[PDB]
Amino acid sequence: ELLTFPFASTGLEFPPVYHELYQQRLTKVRLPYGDDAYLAIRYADVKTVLSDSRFSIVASLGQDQPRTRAGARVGNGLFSLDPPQHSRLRSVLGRDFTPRRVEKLRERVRELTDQCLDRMEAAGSPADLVAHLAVPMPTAVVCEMMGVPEPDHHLFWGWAETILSNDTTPDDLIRRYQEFTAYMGAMVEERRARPTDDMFGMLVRACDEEGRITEIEMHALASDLLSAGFVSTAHQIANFTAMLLARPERLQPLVDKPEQIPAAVEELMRHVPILSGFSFPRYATEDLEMSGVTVRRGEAVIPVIAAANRDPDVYPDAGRLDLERNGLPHLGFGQGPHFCIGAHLARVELQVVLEALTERFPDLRFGIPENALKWKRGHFMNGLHELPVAW
Template sequence: MTTTARSWSEIFGEPDRLSIDPEFAELRREESLRRVRLPYGEPAWLVTRYEDAKVVLGDPRFSRAAANGRDEPRTRYHVGSPGSLLRHDPPEHSRLRRLVAKAFTARRVEGLRPRAQQIADQLIDRMMAQGPPAELVEDFALPLPITVICELLGVPVEDRVDFRLWSDAFLSTTRFTPEQVTEYVGRMREYMAGLIAEHREEPRDDLIGALVTARDEQDRLSEEELLAMSEGILVAGHETTASQIPNFVYTLLTHPEQLAAVRADPGLIPQAVEELMRYVPLGGGAGSARYALEDVELGGVTVRAGEPVVVALQSANRDESIYADPDTLDLHRREASHVGFGHGPHHCLGAQLARMELQVALGALVQRLPGLRFAGTEQDIVWKTGTATRGPARLPITWDRP
């Protein structure tokens, strides 16, 4: 067992497109835990195995709230607001989550599906009218989830250029300097505070309006919690899906037999989304740190009270003890559920919304753009750098004209 912390970049290097570093497989076989140092914060234990990941993410002996006041291990300069959902444990976390959870239930999300489908169809109508090629990210992958979350939350979609920049800063690892991150995150906070003030002056039937009511009339959250939750939902509500749409398209285009299966059977799309969530490594590093509240035996190693642990979800989703041939994309896979949306109390609040949007996006692209393929070669794809989420920044596509 390695007890001396090594830097993340020393072990894994920079993420390469959507590939998984083979070092993860070696760690799963040979070391249950590894001491690492992320770009920011104190050293931590790194978890790479599926079952260990579920323990860290779901066991109350591991705490997110204990990170408050600590220099927690992280890949980004920005640590987030103390009012954020991600910085609380139950019961405080449960109190905050209940205030917004009803907006993201399976039933409520299904009610949003027709609107999401309408947006997707309108975007594809525009692409088809202009004719191929098109740029998937700007023409489709970004506007679809941004429009949905803006309408749900109560944010003017025409302001997306501004809050897209602020979101990029929020998620920056090296793309922006610490000073720029502080500036842009501050601008986003001022913008959200202004929207909250507008909702107070003119009450509206949207999620910000519901949170304002919970703050002002029911005293169920603080002003800082109101602001932090609004910011968090805006960023998380579009960024993951906007990244995963081009990631999924890229993955299917580079696995033509799986793409052919989806084309032949559109009913396979929900299962395809689950397998793609398992297979595609959205993050390049590790998730938010959890701190052991007591000594815990994990994978044969004693994690001492007060020590932080970080989870590599991309590794847990490729654990060969859980998945047969885990490095193969198999859209018919029926094994254990993935941890692409996390696990435990902090399981992604918007998982159902993301699933629905990804299903709508894949269905619309595959069914309405016959012969969907790369425009040019893979070398024409521009990949994101310096940010917490992986994927194409530009993905030119083309298709067969009718």
């Protein structure tokens, strides 16, 4: 009878069971659905799972995917492939997410952030930072980049939520797939009759003109980016803001030393356990040793990035949020092939958010007692339903 995973925790709590597991050999756990799997929790082990070619993201041996969602996570996009096939598909998007291209979006990200905060401030204190900023701004950034109009943003929230909900059935996934395919089918036909200088338009040229990808691959890449690209940052804006507002000095360290905002963002990326459970298991493609256990060909191992980010040998006093830490590189954006393609855009968003909040609301504080905060309970991610803030 195996340890159950995910573990018990509420909000952004890091559960004490990890402190036990760091002093144990690799541990096998049973999941809500699918096969059992080992839990990689040491920094080095999580790095290995995510970047060593002996770990495949594909269950090519009949495995039942260890998971928290009733419907297995399957499709034709970036999370369904190993290199080189993954690398060839990702290369279609690559150039648009390099630091050199994303750094160009800083001014636009701040424009949208400013518009969000004008409306927040016009709504009056105390106001919900989730509804006024965390949700709208990242949604607008990627929906604009892709070429989706503001009228339709709500459609992509719903499609993204059913992906991320652990009570989503395979039937719900079918409904989502059909609705989404219809919508992007419309978008494709629009761009075939009238090309556009946006990212979906780039994908349509890549399918039609260059023949680099197939239609289903074009849809898959768009679906990956519109599922992953704004609910993520949405959750993290509120998580980061809540983390800061819960300390005695709140925003003041960053008001006083704006130049430290990039380091703060990285420490928060390390510290915040953003995942309720985990992402994708990997499967060993040959016998190998990990934290005292022989992982056999075919067996699943889950990379627990949150645990890696509190590895007691990599990070002294790991539970402490120390905005000056500059610890060794966290795994909050993953590692290896599937390292977050949006990593620099998320850094830009989160940095700009802290710039805008410190500059405009230096005395930002919780608008309700902290004990009343409404943390989510059944989402793939940890976060807040609401974040009332006062100034």
